[PDB]
Every structure is written in structure tokens, then in C-alpha cells.
UniProtKB/Swiss-Prot annotation:
Recorded name of the encoding gene: PSME4
Compartments it resides in: Cytoplasm, Cytosol; Nucleus; Nucleus speckle
Known function: Associated component of the proteasome that specifically recognizes acetylated histones and promotes ATP- and ubiquitin-independent degradation of core histones during spermatogenesis and DNA damage response. Recognizes and binds acetylated histones via its bromodomain-like (BRDL) region and activates the proteasome by opening the gated channel for substrate entry. Binds to the core proteasome via its C-terminus, which occupies the same binding sites as the proteasomal ATPases, opening the closed structure of the proteasome via an active gating mechanism.
Taxonomic source organism: Homo sapiens
Name of protein: Proteasome activator complex subunit 4
Superkingdom assignment: Eukaryota
Domain notes: The bromodomain-like (BRDL) region specifically recognizes and binds acetylated histones.
Subunit structure: Homodimer. Interacts with the 20S and 26S proteasomes. Component of the spermatoproteasome, a form of the proteasome specifically found in testis.
Residues of the whole record sequence present: 24 to 168 of 1843
Similarity field: Belongs to the BLM10 family.
Length: 145
């Protein structure tokens, strides 16, 4: 194996065609990593970045996490920096934040040595949106959910 899988879904193992699943997962993971890094590097958020973020979401849901802990910290840091943007479109950050929550739900997987997220970006984020003066005036129109 190229990597040790992390918290892989057992049910995929039980499937009759589970042998092909490993190759499909590895290829899909490679595509996701390369394309998402590239889309951030070129700053093509609306066409491709959200697309590959959604691709990571379906990958996690279908195959479990199934990546190295190094990859896990990298995904976390990227989505955090992307979600922790000062003035990102809120409809945009909704999906990235949903993905980041999906990655971070299984706290036990990450050592607390592996990952060090800061808190001031999140504070500024919620202060922007949970307590927005501009919203009551009708300027900002936050989403419902």
C-alpha cells in the first residue's frame, strides 16, 4: 500500500468488488489532491475549487477518510485557510466549511500533535456573521442555514 488508510469504511471491504475499490480510491485521491492544489494556486475558486472540494466530500463519504495523516493535516490546513478568508462569499464558504467539519468530526484520528489550528480567524469569521450590524440593515443577506 502506498499509504496506511485512516478510519477506512468497513462496508466497502465487504462488497464483492472491493478489490477494485482500492485502485479507484487511490486514483481518485490523487486527482483530488493535484487538481485542488492547482485550483487554489491559480485562484479558480468558483469554476474548479468548489468542484474539487465537493469531490473530496463525496470521496470521504464513499470511501471513508482513507488517506495518510500527512494528507489529513494538509487538507485541514488548506480548507481552514480557504474558509478563514476575510471576505469570502458566504455561500462559497458554506460548502468548504461543511467539508472541514466532515474532516474534523473524528477527533481521535488526529493526535493534537499532528494538527495546530488557530482561533482568531474563526473568531473574526463568526463576529462578521453571527453579530453583523450590516445585516439588520439588509446589506449582507446571510444564508438561512
Amino acid at each position: 500500500r502506498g499509504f496506511v488508510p485512516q478510519k477506512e469504511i468497513v462496508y466497502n471491504k465487504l462488497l464483492p468488488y472491493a478489490e477494485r475499490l482500492d485502485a479507484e480510491s487511490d486514483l481518485q485521491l490523487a486527482q483530488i489532491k493535484c487538481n485542488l492544489g492547482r485550483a487554489v494556486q491559480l485562484q479558480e475558486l468558483w469554476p474548479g475549487g468548489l468542484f474539487w472540494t465537493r469531490k473530496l466530500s463525496t470521496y470521504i463519504r464513499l470511501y471513508g477518510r482513507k488517506f495518510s495523516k500527512e494528507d489529513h493535516v494538509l487538507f485541514i490546513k488548506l480548507l481552514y485557510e480557504l474558509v478563514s478568508i476575510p471576505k469570502l462569499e458566504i455561500s462559497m464558504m458554506q460548502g468548504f466549511a461543511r467539508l472541514l467539519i466532515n474532516l474534523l468530526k473524528k477527533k481521535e484520528l488526529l493526535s493534537r500533535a499532528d494538527l495546530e489550528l488557530p482561533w482568531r480567524p474563526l473568531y473574526d469569521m463568526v463576529e462578521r456573521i453571527l453579530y453583523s450590524k450590516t445585516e439588520h440593515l439588509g446589506l449582507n443577506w446571510f444564508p438561512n442555514s
